[PDB]
């Protein structure tokens, strides 16, 4: 398997970064009976899901890792058919109710109650808790109050702001900061020593960390790709490998900066259409485009300020809209006008 998955820590002892959080999780697992509801919030690819699984293993055992998958169908008012992919285990459940759109609440109430009927307790891990609707969060608070005896919720999110105060009061907030570049370098060094990868110097690993912006998953996958390209021998001159969509977005940024015209906008539209059609989210496209534009060295302070203002405006418009290409094209046109 990929090195990101093969060397993922399978226990609280195998975690290497954020020692304080590891000690806190060990203390939490030392008293399984009084386990509180948890809400782990932090940047993507920092190890939240890995830490949740390690805590579950500490409480129950290795059997949490013997994971099964099952599609569960829910009967709802209006007689609609909804299917949810539950990753279950003989000790815990994992759900992503946001995949059910605005039906997530009726998905949760039907499911969690059932679990409470099937039961010391069974843990439920809710992914993307920040993207749940407010009604779903109210239902989650109701299930926390009613079924605290048999249900312990472990919510994972990238930002706790969308979470409601009633949930925050009844749950333990756990902040998971992204690892420092030194810790990422240490992890990559352990991976390359395990995989017997040649290194001209350790600085290459440092560069990889600086390329991942604190994203451990991205850094590990980038290291694997670089090793595969360089015949398992990384040199100091080995270029940093970026994903296809990031390269496309950087090319788009260079095109926008170089030429500002209507034809350039027309071709930027085709580039954006390709990116959107190949499952690149609109918010990701906008954020990457904005932060590539802000890194151009030929733009002055006024241009960058206008760019970030337009980015904020059209980010709000993307969050309030349906057709993403409309807002992306509007943002690019405004940036082109600002630069010219």
């Amino acid at each position: 398997s990929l090195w990101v998955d093969k060397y993922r820590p399978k226990s609280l002892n195998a975690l290497s970064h954020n020692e304080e959080l590891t000690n806190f999780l060990k203390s939490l697992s030392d008293q399984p009976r009084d386990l509180p509801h948890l809400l782990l919030y932090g940047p993507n690819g920092t190890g939240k899901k890995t830490r949740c699984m390690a805590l579950l293993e500490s409480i129950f055992g290795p059997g949490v890792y013997r994971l099964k998958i099952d599609v569960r169908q829910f009967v709802t008012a209006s007689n609609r058919k909804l299917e949810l992919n539950v990753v279950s285990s003989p000790y815990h459940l994992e759900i992503t109710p946001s995949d059910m759109g605005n039906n997530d609440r009726i998905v949760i109430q039907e499911l969690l109650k059932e679990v409470a009927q099937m039961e010391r307790y069974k843990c439920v891990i809710i992914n993307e808790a920040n993207s749940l609707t407010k009604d779903a969060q109210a239902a989650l608070r109701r299930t926390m109050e009613k079924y605290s005896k048999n249900i312990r919720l472990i919510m994972v999110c990238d930002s706790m702001s969308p979470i409601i105060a009633p949930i925050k009061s009844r749950c333990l907030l756990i902040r998971c900061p992204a690892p420092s570049d030194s810790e990422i370098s240490t992890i990559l060094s352990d991976v390359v020593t395990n995989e017997r990868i040649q290194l001209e110097t350790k600085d290459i690993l440092k560069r990889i960390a600086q390329a991942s912006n604190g994203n451990l998953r991205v850094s590990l996958l980038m290291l694997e790709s670089m090793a595969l390209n360089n015949e398992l021998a990384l040199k100091s001159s080995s270029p940093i490998i970026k994903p296809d969509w990031i390269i496309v977005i950087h090319k788009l940024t260079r095109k926008i900066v170089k030429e500002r015209s209507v034809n350039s906008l027309i071709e930027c539209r085709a580039v954006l259409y390709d990116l959107l059609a190949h499952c690149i989210p609109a918010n990701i496209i906008l954020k990457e485009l904005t932060f590539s534009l802000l890194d151009v060295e030929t733009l002055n302070t006024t241009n960058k300020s206008s760019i970030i203002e337009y980015s904020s405006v059209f980010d709000e418009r993307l969050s309030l809209g349906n057709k993403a290409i409309f807002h992306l094209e509007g943002f690019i046109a405004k940036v082109m006008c600002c630069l010219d």
């Binding site: 209006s78 007689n79 609609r80 058919k81």
Partner: protein
């Protein structure tokens, strides 16, 4: 005492030729009625434009005397339950009423876009099972919300809002059939108030005829419950913001007019302000629409109307 027959009900279209707008769709329906063998169809368009009325007229033309029992109209969002309405559909469809060979039993479903995928699939199965005798017409607002298997089997017809010419033609026909004394300005006012709403236009015409007998602008505006267009025009075209706010306070807000009526009349009046350049009219319409959207989201206060007037004045002074 006797029977009550309002004009909106008496002059509702019965045959296909009684419909004014949607020339292409009406021509298609007339051809279908002429050659017989009505295919399954999906009529899509904005709500309130009488989409179901056209297929009802088609059913009247196809069956006629057998219309009273050979046509089943139902609502997909019935509060009684989707299961019970589906069972009613099946029971009606499996029946074998004697009909001429060139005609078929007809089922009309309204608000079909709200059905779930499973219900739509079940309806497709039921339609296929009894396709030899029963044909289906689905009325919807959004055509994309109907699943592809249903869309492929049906012919798509699109219904649009009636233009002012169609409303004028229908009103003239009603007036001629009712020997109603009128003036050009009265009909212009009625058409102005009802933006393609044939039922509202007919109701306003009947109320004006009953209240005053002669249909002119003054009597129409007295009958019409919306704010008077002259007052809204004075509010919009006032050269001073204080004058506009005073007009809004005294003549519209304190007169019991809701904010929705105020913004709708402002939109209608701004569309027709020929004295103003079209760019300024478009800017004013954009501001009015923004405040209308804010009102429809639940704010609907007087402060929103005051801000709309302030923005309109700011645009006017350039």
């Amino acid at each position: 005492l006797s029977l009550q027959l309002p004009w909106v009900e008496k002059y509702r279209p019965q045959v296909l030729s009684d419909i004014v707008g949607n020339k292409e769709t009406i021509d298609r329906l007339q051809q279908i009625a002429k050659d017989g063998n009505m295919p399954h169809m999906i009529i899509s368009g904005m709500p309130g434009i009488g989409k179901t009325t056209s297929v009802h007229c088609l059913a009247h033309e196809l069956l006629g005397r057998s219309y009273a029992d050979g046509v089943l109209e139902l609502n997909a969002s019935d509060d009684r339950g989707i299961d019970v309405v589906r069972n009613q559909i099946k029971h009606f469809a499996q029946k074998k009423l004697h009909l001429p060979p060139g005609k078929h039993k007809i089922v009309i479903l309204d608000e079909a876009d709200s059905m779930t995928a499973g219900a739509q699939q079940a309806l497709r199965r039921t339609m296929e099972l009894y396709s030899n005798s029963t044909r289906f017409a689905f009325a919807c607002n959004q055509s994309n919300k109907i699943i592809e298997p249903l869309q492929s089997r049906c012919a798509i017809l699109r219904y649009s809002k009636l233009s002012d010419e169609d409303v004028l033609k229908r009103l003239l026909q009603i007036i001629k059939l009712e020997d109603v004394k009128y003036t050009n300005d009265g009909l212009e006012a009625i058409i102005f108030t009802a933006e393609g709403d044939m039922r509202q236009a007919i109701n306003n015409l009947q109320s004006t005829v009953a209240g005053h007998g002669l249909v002119n602008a003054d009597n129409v505006f007295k009958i019409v419950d919306s704010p008077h267009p002259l007052i809204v025009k004075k509010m919009l075209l006032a050269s001073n913001l204080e004058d506009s706010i005073q007009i809004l306070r005294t003549d519209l807000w304190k007169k019991g007019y809701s904010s929705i009526d105020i913004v709708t009349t402002s939109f209608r009046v701004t569309k027709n302000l020929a004295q103003v350049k079209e760019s300024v009219r478009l800017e004013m319409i954009k501001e009015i629409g923004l405040t209308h959207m804010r009102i429809l989201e639940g704010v609907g206060t007087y402060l929103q109307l005051a801000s709309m007037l302030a923005k309109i004045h700011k645009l006017n002074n350039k």
